[PDB]
Amino acid sequence: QIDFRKKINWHRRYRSPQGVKTEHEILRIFESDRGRIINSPAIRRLQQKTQVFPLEAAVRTRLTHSMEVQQVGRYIAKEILSRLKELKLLEAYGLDELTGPFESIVEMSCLMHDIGNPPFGHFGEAAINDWFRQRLHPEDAESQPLTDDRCSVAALRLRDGEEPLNELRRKIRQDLCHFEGNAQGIRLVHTLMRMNLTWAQVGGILKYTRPAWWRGETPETHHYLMKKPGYYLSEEAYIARLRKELNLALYSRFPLTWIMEAADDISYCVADLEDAVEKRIFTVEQLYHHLHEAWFSLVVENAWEKSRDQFFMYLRVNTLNKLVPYAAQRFIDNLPAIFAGTFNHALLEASECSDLLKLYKNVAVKHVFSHPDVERLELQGYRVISGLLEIYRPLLSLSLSDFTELVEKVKRFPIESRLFHKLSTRHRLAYVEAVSKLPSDSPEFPLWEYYYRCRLLQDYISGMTDLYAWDEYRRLMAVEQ
Amino acid sequence: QIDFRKKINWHRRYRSPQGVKTEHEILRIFESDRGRIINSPAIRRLQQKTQVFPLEAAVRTRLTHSMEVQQVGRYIAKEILSRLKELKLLEAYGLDELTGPFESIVEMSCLMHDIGNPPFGHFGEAAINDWFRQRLHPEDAESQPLTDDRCSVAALRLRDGEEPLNELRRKIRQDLCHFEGNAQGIRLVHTLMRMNLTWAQVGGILKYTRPAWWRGETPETHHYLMKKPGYYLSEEAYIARLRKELNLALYSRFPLTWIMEAADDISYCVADLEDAVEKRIFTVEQLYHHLHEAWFSLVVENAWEKSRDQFFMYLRVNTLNKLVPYAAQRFIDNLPAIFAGTFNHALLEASECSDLLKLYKNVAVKHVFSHPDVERLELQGYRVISGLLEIYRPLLSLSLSDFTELVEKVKRFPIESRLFHKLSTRHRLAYVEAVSKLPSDSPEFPLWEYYYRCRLLQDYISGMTDLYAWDEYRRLMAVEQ
Amino acid sequence: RLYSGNLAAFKAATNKLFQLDLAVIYDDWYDAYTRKDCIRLRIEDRSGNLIDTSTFYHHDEDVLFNMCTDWLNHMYDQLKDWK
Amino acid sequence: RLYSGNLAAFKAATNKLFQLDLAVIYDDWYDAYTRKDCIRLRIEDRSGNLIDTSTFYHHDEDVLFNMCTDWLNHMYDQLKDWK
Amino acid sequence: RLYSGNLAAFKAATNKLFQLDLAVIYDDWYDAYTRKDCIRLRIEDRSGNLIDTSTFYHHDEDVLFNMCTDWLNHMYDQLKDWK
Amino acid sequence: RLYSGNLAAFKAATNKLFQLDLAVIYDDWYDAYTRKDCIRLRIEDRSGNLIDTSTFYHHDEDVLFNMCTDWLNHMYDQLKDWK
């Protein structure tokens, strides 16, 4: 049975609005949620993170790209609603008084896609992962205790003769080396910023369902929904309640997420291409030549012939009118599986749409991503992140008593105290609240404390912009005053 | 009679969609208009223009402020629509099938408010106005020809013995010294970018109705709607047709504009205050002390007491819930006058709302705008704009034949040819199209050609960002390589 | 804030009055009782004797400056017949 | 693009196989007939003799690398009983 | 390229002619048939009536500008006896 | 402020005690009644049982750290005969 009233939940985790409500009150609730999301410092941080080219011209940032993803998602949602209304299935599916929340949730999910990426993107995550992999060596805990354990932490070594504590070390060691943008985005929205969003809004940004501490093979019935980590170990309990609030089974997905994913796949191509022309790399004639060589008739021929700042404004429209109805029909056709949360495919994943998207992608890979500047920026970002982690390493070499004393107020740790004071207030408060709730008598306290210390370091590193991290890296290395 | 079908016009100037259409086609038209507006280079230029503080931290730009104005406008429009639907007047006013276009037009008008401001804002416009006032001296043409005409252009002097040509010189001389952001925005949307928006969307950004070439006193029945220039002399014909497309009388205003204006008045205060804290100028305690000294009970007391990144998220909400319903009721109460276009007041212009807004404004003026950095940036921007105009002055000293020959291809004007080639392609094409249509035999040709040359210079100067203009100013002065 | 062109027009009117061998005295404040801003102008001569004095009230300064400039031009037309 | 952790797991499996005195040969291409990407792995020894060879097809590379790593771990378990 | 002094002399001659209440019309192009560059000058008055018109051909522009300046000075001497 | 060498000596004594399979617990505060600063040290073992605990008072921290280091070395000599 399909009933969207069981999925669009307007309750909250704190000070939730209880009782009965009408359409107007629900709409006001979701407008308030939009008000909290739009006026957040995370968006203004998105304002100054690079997409492809270094920040100078009128090249695009994360924010302008999010503004295209939002538009595409809203247009697809409107097409779906119109097609459902035409077939007289809108009232039978429980969506009669929930169209506004539908569109608002899709738009806000599209706006929050890039909230949790670290500086420099794909090359920031790689650096963090390699650093922590060198420090922890998670591949040595997959089986019974060894004598050649390469871990550098005494408390995280698998010391044979104790099986209840080992399971926990395995989980922590595997989790700490799987930083991912979406899991950090969930953590940021819930724990670090404390925005208190509705359950549906939080579920709209849960893209993948694989736990970060997973070891082994995934079931054949979920191999696509579990291709990337979805959430960390510190949010597990939270996620559990989320499922109880949205009637989701284990490793399942919230319906509207599919729409958002679709949007992130269209814009991803076309926008990049345009910027290549604006930076004076090549021109329109070369665009058509490369497209024709790498190859369709309708869009390409209309764009090339009707053209003989206004070429792209004509090229987008045709692509949208060719792609959006296909996504709407794919959503409506497989609706029961999506509502169940077990659809193991994507909307746009053998039609001509795949061919056109692959054409755009391969042209972009051949003529844009191979430019020396992108490549140089990518290497520089990797080195900067590694250097920052090396600089902040001494905070992880302390002991439980020393770090605890350092948190409460020292005269014995000048360098460490200054480094700790350099961190932000919100991250330290999050650490304090996380550690306070732990039982202070179990033999599992040091493990959790180390996990939360590493989490604090990763939050600090990932909460920067490109320019801020770069400048701070040169300042801490005594290269500039 | 109120009928919003006579005001929401979806026709276009070029390749207009004719015939009959349903709700879905109209919604698709307005979604397409949103698609053209959002993906424009003007928005990406807004991305890098300063609001109050210099561009570094997470301070706000034009774009993020536009994103708050858009949200407020959408919320007010939704409140108005809900209140009209409650009273069973939605179908009697012709708005039954036009709610989506209503909200979309209001949002897009709020997004395009700052599209036409020059670099450095209020201090850029002042510099342009003073430079052209020195060059033209418009105050010497108000009456019969004089012997002490201080104008520096031979063709613009008022030479006694000819009254038909004098009227034109007066108009051009008065118009050229009244650069204004909204008139330039209209010119940019229509002539320079060629976006081909619908009539209602263009009418939504017509804020004031006074012509730029106006001399004397304005009628007592329009003294508020004509306090600022509204459009230039090169758009007059265009504006005429706009009125015929929206049933607007002379010096009248399009209804929905009122809503947009209201939004620009709320955000204007509160946002600035928050940024003052983020740049480490003063703190929360000082905020309350200054507010209490400069003074109400509900908002201020709830904000100050429930608080003992999350303080402002609580302060906004209360202000919105206190202000938006007042604006909705003011819109609905005086609806016939607004629909006629002759309402000579603003929505928020003796209630407690005015007192609260004045409180915020005076606190901001006392503790934020008096900081030395803002003041220094303001002086530097003035000097930069004056220097750029002085540098490009030699282009205005040429003759008709010389400039015409320079446009068609020179060996006699090296410096002038390089300066001309430094201008953008779109502005030169606009000049070519504007001048081609002029009759090449009338004695009025030099006057119009000089007017369009000055317009070309002003478009080039106003089409820059702060950083681009600053860098170009240092490069052209041989201060940096 | 106040638009530059309105201030320029007011300054031009003031200069025209001053070149006519007259003195213009400007005072301004805010009245919270009426919830508006008030501007008083006092015209004088080379000796320092009051001739015409008027005060204007408004909540928006753009209209206030326009009214002041209009009044200044009206007096200039009145007293520029001669003397 | 491909996620870093999946590549790290694949590299770890390759290193584990190589430390077992085995050779892993990797080849890849794209098949436009099936509209997918293909990866073939050929396991060998110190002498250079084929033992097990398999090819995988998929349209998304994240799933493809996971399948390859799973197969490599399965063979390692099979042939690590001894020899 | 053209030397600066020759251009300065040509401009000085043009200004001298223009101060004499005359109009100088300049046109130029290239003739590939003769493999040279051509410059035509058309002298006029305040009413816009042709008086003297001549065209010069050459392969080097320095000599061409010198010839043009010489012709302009010759006409100025001719028509500066009076009127 | 505290001199670096004194802190280094105290850290060396602490490390020597810790390598001896002992635990050193450090606490400090200020006593305004006596107008001085107080440092208490509590020695323990791998099980977490108190052995020796002492508190020192002084107005200058350089002497206080020297006294603490001297006491730590004295206990190390006492308990390093064996066990």
UniProtKB/Swiss-Prot annotation, chains A, B:
Kindly give the InterPro entries that the UniProt entry links to this protein: dGTP_triP_hydro_central_sf, dGTPase, dGTPase-like, dNTPase_1, HD/PDEase_dom, HD_domain
Q: What is this protein called?
A: Deoxyguanosinetriphosphate triphosphohydrolase
Q: Which keywords does this Swiss-Prot/TrEMBL entry list? A: Hydrolase, Magnesium
S-S pairs: none
* EC supergroup of this enzyme: hydrolase
Among its keywords, does the record have Magnesium?
yes
Q: What does this protein do?
A: dGTPase preferentially hydrolyzes dGTP over the other canonical NTPs.
What does the subunit comment say?
Homotetramer.
User: Could you name the domain of life of the organism this protein comes from?
Assistant: Bacteria
Query: Required co-factor?
Result: Mg(2+)
Highest classification ranks of the organism: Bacteria, Pseudomonadati, Pseudomonadota, Gammaproteobacteria, Enterobacterales
The EC code for this enzyme is: 3.1.5.1
Reaction(s) catalysed by this chain, per the record, are: dGTP + H2O = 2'-deoxyguanosine + triphosphate + H(+)
The record's GO molecular-function terms, alphabetically, read: cobalt ion binding; dGTPase activity; GTPase activity; identical protein binding; magnesium ion binding; manganese ion binding; single-stranded DNA binding
Swiss-Prot record, chains C, D, E, F:
Mention one GO biological process in which this protein takes part, according to its record: DNA replication
Report which superkingdom the organism of origin falls in: Viruses
The record's annotation in Pfam families points to: T7-like_gp12 (PF10922)
Keywords for the protein's UniProt record, in alphabetical order: DNA replication, Early protein, Host-virus interaction
Q: What does this protein do?
A: Plays a role in increasing the intracellular pool of dGTP. Interacts with and inhibits host dGTPase/dgt. The complex made of the host dGTPase and gene 1.2 protein creates a GTP-binding site of high affinity. Subsequent binding of GTP to the enzyme-inhibitor complex inhibits its dissociation.
User: Quaternary state and partners of this protein?
Assistant: Interacts with host dGTPase/dgt.
UniProt protein name? Inhibitor of dGTPase
Gene source species: Escherichia phage T7 (Bacteriophage T7)
